[PDB]
């Protein structure tokens, strides 16, 4: 489903992200909360103002999880087993929301990396995020 070529493309994009994975994670969240106000209802316990400490910390966690997925891209169900337990069994997140966050991550990468975000790389990244999204909304204990 992800091809050898898809894997090479994803790893290439992530190389260019460099040390900035945490910043991009936080920006993607902020874009989601403002454009799509209904997503705020999953975080009633957060301060959701621009530049809040809680959104910065959470952005770093989301980013670091995606880096581990890239490093274990041959077996995503094996690598993400614990995170699936959380999003599927405990939080019960509607799949529509994963589409909104994935879109906002693409908008963020497009904004910061205009020369690396080619149509072919855009295609491989959309697939990778869709695969991650499916793992996180599936129950497989």
């Amino acid at each position: 489903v992800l091809s050898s070529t898809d894997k090479s493309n994803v790893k290439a994009a992530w190389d260019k992200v460099g040390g900035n994975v945490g910043e991009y994670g936080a920006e993607a969240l902020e874009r989601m909360f403002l454009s799509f106000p209904t997503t705020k209802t999953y975080f009633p316990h957060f301060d959701l103002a621009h530049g809040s400490s809680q959104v910065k910390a959470h952005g770093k966690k989301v980013g670091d999880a995606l880096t581990n997925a890239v490093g274990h891209i041959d077996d995503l169900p094996g690598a993400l087993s614990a995170l699936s337990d959380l999003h599927a069994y405990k939080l019960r997140v509607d799949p529509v929301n994963f589409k909104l966050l994935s879109h906002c991550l693409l908008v963020t990468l497009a904004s910061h990396l205009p020369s690396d975000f080619t149509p072919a790389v855009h295609a491989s990244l959309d697939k990778f995020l869709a695969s991650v999204s499916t793992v996180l909304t599936s129950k497989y204990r």
């Binding site: 403002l34 454009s35 879109h103 908008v107 497009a110 904004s111 205009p114 149509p119 855009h122 295609a123």
Partner: protein, 146 residues
């Protein structure tokens, strides 16, 4: 839905700076590469078999411009989008057989293209106003399917 006075101002400001001959073609091309089944609707346009082929095709670029012009007319009639798009809705349903889910995908690809062109200027606030516009257009194009 209603755009606020501020949302309307942000939309008008960015749109006056758009490359009219460029943005529409890039949006239609990315639709065909990212969501490859959409290639089937445009079979008469030529070779669409790889990313490089799609992005180099002259008929894809020209049609993308016509799509952009239609968005531009919509921006001048935001409180009567159903009347404005009534004829085009009939066409996409009765003649072209395009499933309405694809109208949403094209709107979001357009947003990704505006991001790539404008960078830091495409703030979360500007993005939010454009999401209301692309949703309104998608709904208006779907209205004669029902």
């Amino acid at each position: 839905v209603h755009l606020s006075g501020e949302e309307k101002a942000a939309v008008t400001g960015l749109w006056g700076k758009v490359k009219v001959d460029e943005v529409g073609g890039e949006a239609l091309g990315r639709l065909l590469v990212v969501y490859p089944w959409t290639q089937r609707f445009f079979d008469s346009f030529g070779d669409l078999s790889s990313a490089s082929a799609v992005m180099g095709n002259p008929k894809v670029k020209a049609h993308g411009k016509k799509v952009l012009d239609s968005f531009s007319e919509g921006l001048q009639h935001l409180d009567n989008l159903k009347g404005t798009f009534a004829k085009l809705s009939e066409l996409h349903c009765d003649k072209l057989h395009v499933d309405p889910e694809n109208f949403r995908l094209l709107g979001n690809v357009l947003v990704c293209v505006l991001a790539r062109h404008f960078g830091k200027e495409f703030t979360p606030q500007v993005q939010a106003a454009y999401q209301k516009v692309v949703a309104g257009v998608a709904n208006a194009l779907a209205h004669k399917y029902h």
